Design a protein around this nucleic acid. Structure first.
Ligand SMILES: [Mg+2]
Ligand SMILES: [Mg+2]
Ligand SMILES: [Mg+2]
Ligand SMILES: [Mg+2]
Ligand SMILES: [Mg+2]
Ligand SMILES: [Mg+2]
Ligand SMILES: [Mg+2]
Ligand SMILES: [Mg+2]
Ligand SMILES: [Mg+2]
Ligand SMILES: [Mg+2]
Ligand SMILES: [Mg+2]
Ligand SMILES: [Mg+2]
Ligand SMILES: [Mg+2]
Ligand SMILES: [Mg+2]
Ligand SMILES: [Mg+2]
Ligand SMILES: [Mg+2]
Ligand SMILES: [Mg+2]
Ligand SMILES: [Mg+2]
Lengths: 67, 96, 106, 53, 223
RNA sequence: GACGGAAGGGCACCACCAGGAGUGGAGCCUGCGGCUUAAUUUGACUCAACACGGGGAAACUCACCAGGUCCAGACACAAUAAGGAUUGACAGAUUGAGAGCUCUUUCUUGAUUUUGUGGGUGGUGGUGCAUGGCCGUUCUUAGUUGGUGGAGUGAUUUGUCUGCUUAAUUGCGAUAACGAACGAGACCUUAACCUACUAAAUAGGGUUGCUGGCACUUGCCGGUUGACUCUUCUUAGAGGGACUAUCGGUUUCAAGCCGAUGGAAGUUUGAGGCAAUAACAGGUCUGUGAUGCCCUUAGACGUUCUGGGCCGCACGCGCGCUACACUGACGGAGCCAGCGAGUACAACCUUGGCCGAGAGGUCUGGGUAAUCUUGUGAAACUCCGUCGUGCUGGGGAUAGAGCAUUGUAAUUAUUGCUCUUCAACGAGGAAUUCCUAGUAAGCGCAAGUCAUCAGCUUGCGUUGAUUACGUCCCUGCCCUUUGUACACACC
């Protein structure tokens, strides 16, 4: 049932909007970047956000997505 | 209420010395701490004192708490004969 | 003229772990500045104190139960030292919440 | 003042009094707390007790 | 003196609780909120917070000394081993207990209940809390028991942002017609909270990007 | 809105599939009845009462009953004002009685009072529909507002939805809505991974002293706090770590789901903790010096002693435990956890050694505790022999007898072990409970209780599978659409 929540998705979207460069596809670097730029009071949440950003990046290689 | 008066006097003296009295909510107890009197008697005495003003009471947590007002202090003085500039806890003993 | 090694245990017990840790760190720093042989901030099985209770005041509902737990943190700080130095250290080295206790002698 | 006003109350639920209400009902003697559980379940947070798991 | 460490700690906790209760009872007029016990060798410091600190103090060593004596009597310790200090609380608005006490006082003297609640809420908002909530349960005209919820801003009900974030205060208010119960939950603002996390655990905020100009000829800049 | 014996969607092992393990059967132990009683005190009654009130009650408990005792009638006002207000009082009568309870005698006792009138306090007395508080339940379901916009004269509504997913109002998309909040999530504690960090004569492991036992050669196996260093395991601290990652197709190649690879860990990583909106006339006034009112009040519902009783049985129901065998049984023999908790002002956890067939005692301890009880050397389990499908050595039930132990007090066996008696019960009818992984079930231990008791609860390990991995057929809820003459809402 691993549907990413509204909040995570929103955060990912925001990240993509503001920092479309510096999101180097793979997870690990991206995670670190997320931790740096976005302020998350958690770790797991940050990781989730990173994952979603990576997914978005992967998508955006194979076309344009809505929003 | 039928207090052997010596005991009562002792209790009063103790109160005056302290400025403060802490009583257990323990009736059936043979003897109170500090004073060689029954807890019950002490409690009764303090109740009596309260009923005519004098003492402020708390029932908190199986413990009765007793602080003496100015009128109460005066009454105690009258009882004991001690004149002026005396103990309770209205002022510090020196530097403490 | 003195300097007679006693070997001194310091107890550090409390609940609020962060504070305890800070205290421990401070103690170790102080030891370093007075330069002594010392065993570290040895940690013991952090004792939980469990009290499990019916949540209901009166036993009329579903059988809800709550485990009210108390985390405890027991720390030994061993010093190869005389007593005077320990005394000097324990002039300060007290922070609110945490229990500072000196066992003294080996 | 009467001579016989006490039973041999060394133990049992009689001697065991609570620290708040003095109840003989559901007394957590454990850890030397001596509280009737209901009251504890209200004060516990100040007694340092918390629930996590 | 000296028991099992766990046991000792438990006893200390119990003592603290007892003390708190006593202060709630004894210092009711004094506008008391919290106790801050500091146990060191010899001198045990007991900090006490209230709205009306002057009352607590008395006229230099009045009530406080009496309280000290009482404490000594309770727990066997001697004169000097227990010290008591009374302090001003840094803005009472964030403090739930104080607010509850104030509400109780307002009720007991004779005032409009709803209006009082609203006033309290306003005060809290002015102080600078993110939100707050008052609940007044009992008879508020007519026999049937009525709840009365009054709120401002967000109120987080679930999660560990409660034990870290929301000061809660429950009180019984005694009346001639029947006993009222006043619950008050206060949403302290994340930033001013200091202890624990400085923001709400779900929230994610990202900073503004900074602009960089590319090309402009490679060039060499030497020292 | 609620409701329908309407229509569809959509959940949910408190629903059913496919399964298991069963309960109801049998014996008991324990609630609840119903009676009965001196009193068998009571609070509950579909899920949301019925091993529950932390309720395993020998007195205490204690709320019940039969009796005795006491004032703990505060203060305010009067008659006594010492030529006396007054508490006591062994002996024996009196008297359950080394209770002067009261009467006898005749010494004390020292204006505290005696006893009335105003008045209060106490109450496990009542009212939970007068309440607070807490709890339970709708529901741990996925709900619930609000700001600006639209539709409305309005109440309202849209947002919050045709659809597809999700554990989820979880999201994607469609779209007079857009962006928001609470709730779900996130968070938090724990359980898992770290041969990388932080350290440990309170956790451990190494090399050599001293020697113990060997094979007899160098080498094994040890014990011993000797010395030394490490930190894998143990412990926590600090961090990190999994984000459905990596491809494979599916589905508008959306949201997502399934399969393989890697990986400690791919069921929200497992388990909770917390938990919205409104409520229910749900539960308690027997947790309260939390309590409005009414009641009662000193030949008391205040108290306290003495004894019983809440444990009665013609019989209803519900929790459980033990059995119905060869997956055994009994001996041996092997031998393994994890949570725990445990005293100095006391009567703790208690090793180790002599005496007792047990049960146990005693002298010495060690532990206000990773250090001692303790490697809690637990059970289940694993080997050999004996008896082999008989109400039998399965089963240990109704029962007599001693010795102990607890506690002043054990009869109505408190409990304990020993010899005995050795019954009902040959896999449980109708109904239905619980469950989807270290989960079910088995098997113990510990804590809670606790002077004493476990068959109970909380916990923790220890063995450890079957079958789904779905669907609305039944049950319950949920939302939509519908109708309604109900809104104290179909009781
Ligand atoms: Mg939230
Ligand atoms: Mg949550
Ligand atoms: Mg239900
Ligand atoms: Mg019994
Ligand atoms: Mg009462
Ligand atoms: Mg009700
Ligand atoms: Mg509008
Ligand atoms: Mg709507
Ligand atoms: Mg697929
Ligand atoms: Mg979870
Ligand atoms: Mg009702
Ligand atoms: Mg009452
Ligand atoms: Mg009963
Ligand atoms: Mg049950
Ligand atoms: Mg051990
Ligand atoms: Mg036979
Ligand atoms: Mg039980
Ligand atoms: Mg019609």
């Amino acid at each position: 049932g691993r549907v990413r929540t509204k909040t995570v998705k929103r955060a990912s979207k925001a990240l993509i909007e503001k920092y479309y460069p510096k999101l180097t596809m793979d997870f690990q670097t991206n995670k670190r970047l997320c931790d740096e730029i976005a302020t998350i009071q958690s770790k797991r949440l940050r990781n989730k956000i990173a994952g979603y950003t990576t997914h978005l990046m992967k998508r955006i290689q194979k076309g344009p997505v809505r929003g | 209420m039928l207090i052997p008066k010596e005991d009562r006097k002792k209790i009063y003296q103790h109160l005056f010395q302290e400025g403060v009295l802490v009583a257990k909510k323990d009736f059936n107890q043979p003897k109170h701490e500090e004073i060689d009197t029954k807890n019950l008697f002490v409690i009764k005495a303090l109740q009596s004192l309260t009923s005519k003003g004098f003492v402020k009471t708390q029932f908190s947590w199986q413990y009765y708490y007793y602080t003496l007002t100015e009128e109460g202090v005066v009454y105690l003085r009258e009882y004991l004969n001690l004149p002026e500039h005396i103990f309770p806890a209205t002022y510090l003993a020196g530097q403490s | 003229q003195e300097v007679v090694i006693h070997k001194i245990r310091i107890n550090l017990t409390s609940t609020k772990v962060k504070q305890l840790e800070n205290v421990s760190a401070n103690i170790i720093k102080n030891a370093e500045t007075f330069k002594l042989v010392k065993k570290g901030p040895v940690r013991l099985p952090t004792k939980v104190l469990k009290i499990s209770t019916r949540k209901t005041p009166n036993g009329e509902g579903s059988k809800t139960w709550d485990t009210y737990e108390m985390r405890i943190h027991k720390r030994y700080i061993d010093l190869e030292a005389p007593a005077h130095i320990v005394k000097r250290i324990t002039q300060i080295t007290i922070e609110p919440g945490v229990d500072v206790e000196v066992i003294i002698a080996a | 003042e009467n001579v016989w006003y006490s039973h041999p109350r060394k133990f049992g639920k009689g001697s065991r009094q609570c620290r708040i209400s003095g109840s003989h009902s559901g007394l957590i003697r454990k850890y030397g707390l001596n509280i009737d559980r209901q009251s504890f379940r209200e004060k516990a947070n100040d007694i340092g007790f918390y629930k996590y798991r | 003196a000296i028991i099992s460490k766990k046991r000792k700690l438990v006893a200390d906790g119990v003592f603290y609780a007892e003390l708190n209760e006593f202060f709630t009872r004894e210092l009711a007029e004094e506008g008391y909120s919290g106790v801050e016990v500091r146990v060191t060798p010899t001198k045990t410091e007991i900090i006490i917070r209230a709205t009306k600190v002057q009352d607590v103090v008395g006229e230099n060593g009045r009530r406080i000394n009496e309280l000290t004596l009482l404490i000594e009597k309770r727990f066997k310790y001697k004169r000097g081993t227990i010290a008591l200090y009374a302090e001003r609380v840094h803005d009472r608005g964030l403090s739930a207990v104080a607010q509850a006490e104030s509400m109780k006082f307002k009720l007991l003297n004779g005032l409009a209940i709803r209006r009082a609640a609203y006033g309290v809420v306003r005060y809290v908002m002015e102080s600078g809390a993110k939100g707050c909530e008052v609940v007044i349960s009992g008879k508020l005209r007519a026999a049937r028991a009525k709840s009365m919820k009054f709120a401002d801003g967000f109120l987080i009900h679930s999660g560990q942002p409660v034990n870290d974030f929301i000061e809660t205060a429950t009180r019984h208010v005694l009346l001639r017609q029947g006993v009222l119960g006043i619950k008050v939950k206060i949403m302290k603002d994340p930033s001013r909270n200091t202890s624990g996390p400085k923001a709400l655990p779900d929230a994610v905020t990202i900073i503004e990007p900074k602009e960089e100009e590319p090309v402009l000829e490679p060039s060499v800049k030497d020292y």
